Point group: C3
Chain length 324, copies 3
Amino acid sequence: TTADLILINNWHVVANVEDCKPGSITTARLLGVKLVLWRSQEQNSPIQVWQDYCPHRGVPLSMGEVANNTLVCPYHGWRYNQAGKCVQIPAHPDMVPPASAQAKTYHCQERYGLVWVCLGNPVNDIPSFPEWDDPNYHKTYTKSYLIQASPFRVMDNSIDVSHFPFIHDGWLGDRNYTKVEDFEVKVDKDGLTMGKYQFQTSRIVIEDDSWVNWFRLSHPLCQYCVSESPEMRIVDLMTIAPIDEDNSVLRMLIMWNGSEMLESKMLTEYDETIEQDIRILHSQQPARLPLLAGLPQEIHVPSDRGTVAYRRWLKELGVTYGVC
Amino acid sequence: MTTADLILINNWHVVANVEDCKPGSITTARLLGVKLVLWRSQEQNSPIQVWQDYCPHRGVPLSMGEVANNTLVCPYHGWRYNQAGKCVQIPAHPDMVPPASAQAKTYHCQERYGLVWVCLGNPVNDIPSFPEWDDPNYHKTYTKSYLIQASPFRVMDNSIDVSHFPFIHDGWLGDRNYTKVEDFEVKVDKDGLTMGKYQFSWVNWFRLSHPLCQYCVSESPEMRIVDLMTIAPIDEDNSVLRMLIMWNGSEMLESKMLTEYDETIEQDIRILHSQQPARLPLLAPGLPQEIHVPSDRGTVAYRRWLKELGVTYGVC
Amino acid sequence: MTTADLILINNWHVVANVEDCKPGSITTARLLGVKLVLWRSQEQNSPIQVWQDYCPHRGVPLSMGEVANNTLVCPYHGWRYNQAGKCVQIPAHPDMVPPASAQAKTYHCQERYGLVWVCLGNPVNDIPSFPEWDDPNYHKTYTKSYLIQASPFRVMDNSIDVSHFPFIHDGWLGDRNYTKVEDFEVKVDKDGLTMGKYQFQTSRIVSHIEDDSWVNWFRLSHPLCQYCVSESPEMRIVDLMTIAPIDEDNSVLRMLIMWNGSEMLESKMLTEYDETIEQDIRILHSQQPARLPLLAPGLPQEIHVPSDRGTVAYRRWLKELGVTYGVC
Ligand code: FES
Ligand code: FES
Ligand code: FES
Ligand SMILES: [Fe+3]
Ligand SMILES: [Fe+3]
Ligand SMILES: [Fe+3]
């Protein structure tokens, strides 16, 4: 579509590396752009991420096939090498393909088992995830969640902490303990950091009903969360793929230093609470996130200081896509 | 799809039947482009609140919450709104007095004839009158609601139209062998529009003081039937039709009367859904202009009335 | 919606097959954003009327009515319209003189090749010619009608294209081992767009295994109809493809197929066309932008190679004709 600079020139997860097998074709959408992801059959072949579009007659390349180290358009069989250049036009086998015959290619990097894509010029680093190679931690990935809400409303809901005892009653919050103690938030050059805050709840992951959480966003659509009890530490990297201004894909990478056998329960806790959030996200109007300044204007109370700082951060960053 | 037409925004409109709103219940409706939430506390005889279905904190519909004591509680962070619409409790800050702006947008609501009437503006006009409501010799019945994909003014146009009876209502209100329409009278003054007696047996007349409500009278030597038809204007292109039917014959006719009304309402809806343009064409304006014959005098009068009232919503 | 393009409004378009308009029948169609009603009286050999599907009294579709004698009767108040579209009876006022405005909007209709052609405007062009129609050497069959969510001009672009045969029609109209496209000529002139004889290699289900060299040729005098001749040393197949432009983004494709060979080939002829038409539709539905891009020195612009000379010439011809509907 018509996204902004902090968005176009940043890295976004569009797939799990396990989604992209050798010789395979898959698709995604990012910032209004249709993407094709493909790999040759070679062992550990790299992933190409291109705009899903043959410039000859406008057919999606994802409808084609991988042949050797090339992607072949189904309509007239033009073949594109790994750099996106047309190397063969079958109707004219002795013709040099015109230089214009080329797919639009994007930057792709595999990191944390996720496929990261930059549609522009990649001036930012991929967000840090310190536990990735820590041998004390195990990992698991949630399924993806397609959410009919603005990506910035999706992240707003993930920075929100006061909703835990209501839509997450029995999982992350306690309807008996609704008060939200004070906490600190700072927005600097490291992005947005929400400081330590304690909340009363036990988790399927029992007398352990005191958890201290904090989180950081260096990237407005990624969040690194740390949730700690005396017994265990759980971290997660949530990535929100902005399909367009009104639709999102949520993925979460979870790591924990307890027993590896907790994996099933971890995925259940996250699945339950994600779907609880999605019920609210789908209902919110207007769909795009209102920035600080028909329907009434938003109201803020002190426990909204982090979601207020997020709206302020988005404005300073110059975000206009998916917001209002 | 909202309106500034005063005759619409400053008027009363039926949005529900009172039996639909039990104590402790939450229901939804739409009126003139606005999403409404209707709720009652669980105490007996509790009043009906009708609000814009929206929490001003983070934009969640209040209808997704729950009724607790005398309050409607938003599901997202549990802000509690009392029957007057004021937020009385913000659970994250139990000792804080909520901001003055933590307020639901509330609308006027009145129960009359067993229906829930709502005014979204200033209630300048009054609810249409219905004399037989106070008459112990008349039984009453309510049709189900009918959702119609047509402009509410085209819906009312079809109810003022009387020459179609022998065609789409053949066998029920008309007879294909008697198609000629005899002369009848219609006047528009500032009591509204009033169809003079006519007959296709049954002698009928009707009047509208409200452009989307109709009071019909149908009389025979045996008995007389009155109905109050109300057309809820959801937006410019969608309507909810209800009828309140009263009659002074045997009460056991109810099942048949409901069937006769159901048959002919559905015959009308088949026409209403097909008509183009969707908005009602007013007089003197790639589709040709309307044609009028003498038996259209009532629907012509209706188009003239709507122009004098200044209607622009759902009309062209 | 509608178009002011004269080449489209003042031209003839197929909207139905004559077999779907029985005496006494009412059917519907849509053409260039206009809703049509097609009807016939019960009489033997009655003509087909094609009118705007609209009663000017209160705006009801006349197609919801019924045919009575030689009139179409609106269901709402029973106004009766004769074959010329004039209202002859207003039942509420049986003695009145119906106003001149009580008249359906009527269009030009003409049955040819067993198809119903309609002109919404002033017919300055003729229905395209299909010489084999009157040849008793030739058998005929009609495909079913295919609703396609693509611009009618993209649908025709795909039918002018020949280099795609060995790919999406591999095993039917081409061979993945013979993908080179021989040279051929194209002309845009008084006749419209003509692709000269083009030889390609394939065996086909409608002929013998060794009959594996075919020669195609086609002419469009009308930008949404195509007369195509496909010939081998063993058989000659001709077809008249017609694309009904429902609106800018939706089309109805019909094909009338004739061949000079055994009448028993009919089932195989319909199988081949159905299989290849559906392969073409899979591509058509995927193409973006939806409207056909014209020539012009967001999405990257089209590239053209020499075997595109016919589809390039088509884009040039459409601009020369003044087409703006369904093109970009
Ligand atoms: S459209 Fe891709 S090769 Fe022609
Ligand atoms: S959205 Fe209603 S309490 Fe926060
Ligand atoms: S709308 Fe056709 S006769 Fe009245
Ligand atoms: Fe949550
Ligand atoms: Fe009726
Ligand atoms: Fe084809």
